[PDB]
Enzyme design. Sequence first.
Site, short mmCIF file in Angstrom:
data_model
loop_
_atom_site.label_atom_id
_atom_site.label_comp_id
_atom_site.label_asym_id
_atom_site.label_seq_id
_atom_site.Cartn_x
_atom_site.Cartn_y
_atom_site.Cartn_z
N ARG A 247 0.76 -1.25 0.00
CA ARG A 247 0.00 0.00 0.00
C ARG A 247 0.79 1.31 0.00
NH1 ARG A 247 -3.46 -0.22 5.33
NH2 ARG A 247 -1.29 -0.54 5.99
N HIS B 77 9.51 -13.83 21.17
CA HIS B 77 8.79 -13.65 22.42
C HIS B 77 7.31 -13.97 22.38
CE1 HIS B 77 12.33 -12.47 24.16
NE2 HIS B 77 12.43 -11.42 23.38
N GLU C 258 -2.45 -11.62 23.71
CA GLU C 258 -3.36 -11.34 22.61
C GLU C 258 -4.41 -12.45 22.39
OE1 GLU C 258 -2.11 -11.95 18.57
OE2 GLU C 258 -2.66 -9.97 18.04
N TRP D 150 -0.87 -3.77 19.47
CA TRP D 150 -2.01 -3.19 18.76
C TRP D 150 -2.17 -1.67 18.84
CZ3 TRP D 150 -5.06 -5.51 15.33
CH2 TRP D 150 -5.01 -6.90 15.31
N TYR E 93 -11.14 -9.26 15.21
CA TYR E 93 -11.16 -10.64 15.68
C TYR E 93 -12.05 -11.09 16.82
CZ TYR E 93 -6.96 -10.72 12.77
OH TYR E 93 -6.06 -10.64 11.74
N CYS F 118 -6.32 -10.68 8.83
CA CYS F 118 -5.34 -11.36 7.97
C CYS F 118 -5.52 -12.87 8.12
CB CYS F 118 -3.88 -11.01 8.36
SG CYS F 118 -3.40 -9.27 8.11
N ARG G 54 -4.99 -14.61 4.45
CA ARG G 54 -5.03 -13.84 3.21
C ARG G 54 -3.76 -13.13 2.80
NH1 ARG G 54 -6.30 -8.26 5.63
NH2 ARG G 54 -5.05 -7.87 3.76
N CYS H 140 0.33 -12.38 4.44
CA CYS H 140 1.39 -12.75 5.36
C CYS H 140 2.78 -12.16 5.14
CB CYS H 140 1.53 -14.25 5.37
SG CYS H 140 2.82 -14.79 6.51
N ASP H 141 3.33 -11.42 6.10
CA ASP H 141 4.71 -10.96 6.13
C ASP H 141 5.52 -12.11 6.75
OD1 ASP H 141 7.23 -9.73 7.13
OD2 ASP H 141 6.16 -7.96 7.75
N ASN I 171 2.07 -15.67 14.04
CA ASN I 171 0.81 -16.29 13.58
C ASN I 171 0.74 -17.79 13.87
OD1 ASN I 171 1.28 -14.18 10.70
ND2 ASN I 171 0.22 -13.68 12.49
N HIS J 199 4.63 -13.03 1.47
CA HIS J 199 5.68 -12.12 1.05
C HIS J 199 6.78 -11.79 2.03
CE1 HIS J 199 2.28 -9.59 2.72
NE2 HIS J 199 3.32 -8.96 3.18
N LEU J 200 7.81 -11.20 1.45
CA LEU J 200 8.97 -10.65 2.15
C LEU J 200 9.23 -9.20 1.73
CD1 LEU J 200 11.85 -13.31 1.86
CD2 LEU J 200 10.57 -12.76 3.87
N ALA K 90 8.82 0.57 7.23
CA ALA K 90 8.57 1.90 6.76
C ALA K 90 7.23 2.41 7.28
CB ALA K 90 8.53 1.92 5.24
O1 LIG Z 1 -1.52 -11.77 11.52
C1 LIG Z 1 -0.90 -11.02 10.77
C2 LIG Z 1 -1.25 -9.63 10.51
C3 LIG Z 1 -0.54 -8.89 9.56
N1 LIG Z 1 0.46 -9.45 8.89
C4 LIG Z 1 1.11 -8.63 7.85
C5 LIG Z 1 0.39 -8.68 6.51
C6 LIG Z 1 1.06 -7.58 5.73
O2 LIG Z 1 2.42 -7.95 5.49
C7 LIG Z 1 1.00 -6.49 6.81
C8 LIG Z 1 -0.41 -5.88 6.86
O3 LIG Z 1 -0.53 -4.84 7.85
O4 LIG Z 1 1.31 -7.19 8.07
C9 LIG Z 1 0.88 -10.76 9.09
O5 LIG Z 1 1.84 -11.27 8.52
N2 LIG Z 1 0.18 -11.48 10.01
#
Ligand SMILES: O=c1ccn([C@H]2C[C@H](O)[C@@H](CO)O2)c(=O)[nH]1
Lengths: 264, 264
Positions: free
Chosen positions: A21, A51, A58, A80, A94, A146, A166, A168-169, A177, A207-208, A263
């Site tokens: 985005r 950690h 959460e 959060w 959630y 997510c 949907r 994933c970083d 997660n 993604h990375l 960023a």
């Molecule tokens: O449970 C979660 C929540 C967010 N993100 C990532 C998705 C995207 O990379 C960014 C969206 O804010 O953070 C995850 O990997 N897992």
Amino acid sequence: MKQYLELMQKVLDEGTQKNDRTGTGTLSIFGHQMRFNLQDGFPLVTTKRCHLRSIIHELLWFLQGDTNIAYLHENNVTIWDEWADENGDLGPVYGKQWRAWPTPDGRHIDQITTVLNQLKNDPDSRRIIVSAWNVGELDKMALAPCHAFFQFYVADGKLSCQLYQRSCDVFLGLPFNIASYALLVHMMAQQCDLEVGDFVWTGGDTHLYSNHMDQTHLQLSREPRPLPKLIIKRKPESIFDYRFEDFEIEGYDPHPGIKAPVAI
Amino acid sequence: MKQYLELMQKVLDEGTQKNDRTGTGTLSIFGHQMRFNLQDGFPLVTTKRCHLRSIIHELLWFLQGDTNIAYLHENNVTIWDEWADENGDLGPVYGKQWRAWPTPDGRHIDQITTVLNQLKNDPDSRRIIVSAWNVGELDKMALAPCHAFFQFYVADGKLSCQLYQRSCDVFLGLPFNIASYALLVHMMAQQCDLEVGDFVWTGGDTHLYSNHMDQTHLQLSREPRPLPKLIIKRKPESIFDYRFEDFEIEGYDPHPGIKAPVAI
Ligand SMILES: O=c1ccn([C@H]2C[C@H](O)[C@@H](CO)O2)c(=O)[nH]1
Ligand SMILES: O=c1ccn([C@H]2C[C@H](O)[C@@H](CO)O2)c(=O)[nH]1
């Protein structure tokens, strides 16, 4: 973890350049699935120190149907903060969908009690789902879910669970997660007198971030360590009565933690 | 198809004995993912003859937001008869959730137009989802959605799509489920001026009924044939203006059809 390092490698060798985005570039793949047999140990990444204390807090916060930050703040869990408004509200994210999904006719559906009811009285059901993707409430959520949808499955005295994520970083969010969901499979199992089976993680845009490349290469240098063991010190009278101190991770010896900037 | 025969084999060698709703026994696995690159041909099973004409008609029926059987009946498509009541109503199943999801405040959300809007104006979005798992309406549906949730993805001029299927009968239902969704990826692609990419199928309880064993062994004997080519003869002005005669399958030469009975 082996499955996790193989996915990091897959995003490096196969990901297409996609932007996030109006900001950072990412290496991206679509469609991936991994399986963790929870009998083999707790799936907490050992190639970098993670950690768990915020993760537990959460999850217990989600189980109460809590959408305000106050509880996390009493325990100085600050993950959060970034999304919360002036009153600590995150909108109907959630826990509100898990515990009180609103229907068009004024009811609020507790999907977590429905799932325990199904696991106890109808374990072969192919419908044992909880969903957080509430289309009518997405415009009021601080961020759209997510980890959007998950399904339980019972076969041979064992509880398995598949999560659909949907977005994933892989570097910052995914180790978190996985441990979050593996912990809930263990709590549900304990409550239903079932053994733990598999946690299946399914992802969409996996993604990375481009400014995490030095860190992912540093982590891929590292050999995985034996996975840790989760011990629950107490069986609570229901899924909503767990406390932070009920959980212990035994045998966890990670490589040093790696920092990942973002960023703005 | 290779991916499909490898999954049939996997359920035979690995499935656990699980029973279905107060009836037939099944061989069952949980958690599976397959990828079909739609540039390589239309994923219509060639190891047994499949009739696409009901599949097209059901998809066009879903796109109109239609929940009554009348349209299918005018075309003598009878696959939903089993579930329909005395007036031909199925309750708020698929098309009603796709086109008019009801919110707690009286709105009806058209998830199909939202998705086209996102594909045209925000193609890198990680949120391009349509869901049919409406928790508040599940008690009024004739049957709860099996193909419950799907996500689109755009990278490099190409449209990909991942389906989450909670429950799947591998022999009778799955060849039909795949062709149905691959056809929609092609219609969405045509409307957004994108090329087709991958259809990723993800399943939950993926199974084979015990009285379909002779048939699955007969099918696994067969070598797959070259996959067919789908040609769309016309570009309609919108996703809701397609007609049965717009579609042609070219190069389809299957092995003979195999019958699969069901218990009652
Ligand atoms: O449970 C979660 C929540 C967010 N993100 C990532 C998705 C995207 O990379 C960014 C969206 O804010 O953070 C995850 O990997 N897992
Ligand atoms: O799209 C569909 C709908 C139903 N079924 C199966 C699921 C289960 O085997 C049975 C439920 O009625 O039919 C499928 O395979 N695909």
